[PDB]
Swiss-Prot record, chain B:
This is Glycine betaine methyltransferase. The gene is mtgB. InterPro entries: MttB-like_sf (IPR038601), MTTB_MeTrfase (IPR010426). GO terms for molecular function: methyltransferase activity. Pfam families: MTTB.
Length: 475, 476
């Protein structure tokens, strides 16, 4: 009923990586740019020189041992509750992009209306399990209330799970307060998690105050944190795959141990965003087989450490929804699915190494998403199934076009494409639409038809009341 | 170095397929429309009613044991010798397409010049290990001598391995003669196989005269055959994954068991071309995840039966080199690579479920092939390596780009793209070239600057005298 996961590493090699990781954390250490964070380490008997911290293997292997292998995140509509990790996998849009690249190859700043559109699309879509977070940076809006309008867009436009803000102590806490209003208290959400948020390290071997202030805010509440590291081999990490993975490993676990020492059993996702620093281009390259290699190894490491994994997505370096957007996104999304990544931020919409979102790419990515979930269902070994009797009725030289079996079973075992054009030349040649152009017609169809799920009047009567008060307070 | 193969099925599931396949062969049978193949199965003690042969698992499982797990195909230039069957993988162009799809959307008939062009492109590419066969149908040339002209154009334009004709006994025997001239004798090429050729069943549960005629000629000589079944689920096969796989499995093992009855130990490749008959279009769909599942499972069945596999390629249903060409072809080729297919016909050039080759698509596919081979290299766990001391040197907040170890190892471990554009928007926005356009400039550059490897004048002269005489025979 479900394909097994691909593990690309031998068990001796996983041992090498971990032995190298432990050595890094012990010998070289990690700088945490936050007093409260250092205090936690000191109060946990770890070595700490100014901002630097050296964790032993026992302290980390101990802190990991309390980190839960699986946790539900809770949706407003419980029909969309989501189990993290899992032979399970969840998909959701790209995150952080300040640009929209349009079908015409032009570029523009993102807006709240983009955030909102992407919320609706993720809402509308059978394959997007979460509506996501920071889908399109709302430069439309004044900075200190961007989070406020964003979590409200996510609530008013989706009944699926959304993400909390990682931009600071107070922002983090606002988000927790907002989930609280939405589920009826902070205690409810402490035991039934609601938010996930992306906490990043500052490669190589640091953590900035803003991320940390969000991380601890979340681990002191009940809420989920992705501890992602983005090591760019050649640049912010060593020019070797084993090297940059070892470095990524050291960073992610240091973040996990902090959360776990702050709050034992608090939900944490191992995050890998590592890729290549292209030496010809100077810059990040996530459409690379190196990226695909980090995605793949990271999924296996996360199993090894007993925790859920986030990595991959429709990842690529193209500026347009062309053949490159297609083959690079598939390579990285397929890696993520086959190797059993649990949580795929950036499943849909991303172009040019996280620099841009695209409406057409969103639809492209949703197709490949559906195709890969279909691959991962596998084969069905029941009577219908093995189909012996139909093969027999038909016999040598017959066809199956008109069998009852074909009519009943095609629908059951086969994927209906949402985007791919499967017609003959003469049919296609009348308009010669490429995937880009079809994708464009499709997103417009979907936003024209999406009715957002209703939000209890009094709930958003309290959502607004709070956005009002904080609106003043931050000014 | 290299990465382990992905096995998508459990031991039990593999056994269930095998059971369903034996039942199909024992109870339903396959038609072999070629008296000589029928007489082979007769002497083997197998039931024949008219043209229908029923094969027992005792017989099939016995014959499979004589098929080698690995063999070598031998090229003009022995550096291009190729192992079929290890953890090994070999790539080559598309096969059989009668159209070229152009950058501007138009289509036209394939000619001999197209054939030659693809032989050169294959010849020039570091990721194509064979030049292929039937790369473009030479509709240009009288039907009866086409195979003669393709074989020569293969031998002249590339010193890599190439494929024989599968179009009947006589054209197979011509292929064997040509191979024997090139390498010294029929004896030498029986000990050191040279040719590989595509023998398809006629799904469901048939094999026609022309394919059987070629199969038996090649088995009799030492030459490799791909025994390949293309089942279309919902059309020529049942509308189910396990069912279509079982039917394909029955077709292939019936074919391999015939080859091994003729010449025990003769080189065979288990071939899966199975895909979807799409419900809305009524046509073959190879860019489907069903196709990807057939490829993956077949890679693992071949391992089970102890023979090499062929399946997959840059397979897609698109009419143009667009995002669908990209994602469909990467899915099916990545499946092939990760599950450990040995021989990938149609790695490069195919559009629209085998109806077309495209020169831009060839370049695209050559890029995805390169990326995929880099993926399967995997990690390097030596000292340089785990990079601990360079990490120690640099330290928190540092950067690696100005280190000796970066200079040393950047090129060693990282893939350099031949097609993907990794620039920032502002560079790219100057011309806004999409992949298909960059591909278009590249194939023209490659072809323009390609120089075929010198062919021995004496052997060349013999090849031409053989082909001159045969063409006269075929015209009389």
């Amino acid at each position: 009923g479900l394909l097994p996961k691909y593990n690309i590493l031998t068990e001796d090699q996983v041992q090498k990586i971990h032995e190298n990781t432990m050595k890094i954390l012990e010998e070289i250490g990690i700088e945490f740019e936050y007093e409260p964070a250092l205090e936690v380490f000191r109060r946990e008997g770890q070595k700490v020189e100014g901002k630097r911290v050296y964790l032993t293997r026992e302290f980390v292997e101990s802190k990991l041992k309390s980190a839960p292998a699986e946790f539900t995140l809770h949706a407003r509509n419980p029909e969309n509750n989501v189990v993290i990790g899992g032979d399970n996998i969840v998909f959701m849009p790209g995150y952080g992009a300040p640009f929209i690249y349009e079908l015409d190859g032009s570029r523009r700043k993102t807006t709240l209306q983009d955030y909102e559109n992407f919320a609706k699309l993720a809402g509308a879509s059978k394959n997007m399990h979460l509506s996501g977070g920071t889908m399109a940076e709302p430069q439309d809006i004044p900075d200190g209330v961007r989070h406020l309008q964003m979590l409200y867009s996510s609530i008013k436009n989706s009944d699926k799970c959304f993400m909390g803000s990682a931009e600071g102590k107070e922002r983090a806490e606002d988000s927790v307060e907002i989930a609280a209003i939405l589920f009826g208290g902070k205690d409810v959400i402490k035991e039934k998690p609601v938010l996930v948020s992306l906490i990043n390290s500052l490669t190589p071997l640091k953590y900035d105050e803003r991320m940390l202030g969000a991380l601890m805010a979340y681990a002191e509440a009940g809420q989920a944190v992705i501890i992602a590291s983005l090591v760019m081999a050649g640049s912010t990490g060593p020019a070797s795959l084993a090297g940059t993975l070892s470095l990524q490993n050291a960073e992610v676990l240091a973040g996990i141990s902090l959360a776990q020492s702050i709050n034992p059993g608090t939900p944490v996702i191992y995050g890998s965003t590592s890729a290549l620093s292209d030496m010809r281009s100077g810059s990040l390259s996530i459409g690379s087989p190196e990226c695909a290699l980090f995605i793949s190894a990271s999924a296996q490491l996360a199993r090894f450490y007993g925790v859920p994994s986030r990595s991959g997505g429709g990842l690529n370096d193209s500026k347009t929804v062309d053949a490159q957007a297609g083959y690079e996104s598939m390579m990285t999304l397929m890696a993520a699915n086959l190797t059993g990544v649990n949580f795929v931020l950036h499943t849909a919409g991303i172009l040019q190494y996280f620099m841009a979102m695209s409406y057409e790419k969103f639809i492209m990515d949703d197709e490949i998403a559906g195709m890969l979930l279909h691959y991962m269902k596998g084969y069905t070994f029941d009577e219908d199934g093995m189909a012996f009797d139909v093969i027999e009725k038909v016999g040598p030289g017959g066809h199956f076009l008109t069998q009852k079996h074909t009519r009943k079973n095609h629908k059951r075992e086969f994927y209906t494409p949402t985007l791919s054009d499967r017609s003959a030349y003469d049919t296609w040649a009348k308009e010669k639409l490429e995937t880009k152009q079809r994708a464009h017609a499709r997103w417009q169809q979907i936003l024209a038809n999406y009715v957002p799920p209703a939000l209890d009047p009094e709930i958003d009567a309290k959502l607004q009341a709070f956005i009002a008060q904080r609106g003043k307070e931050v000014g």
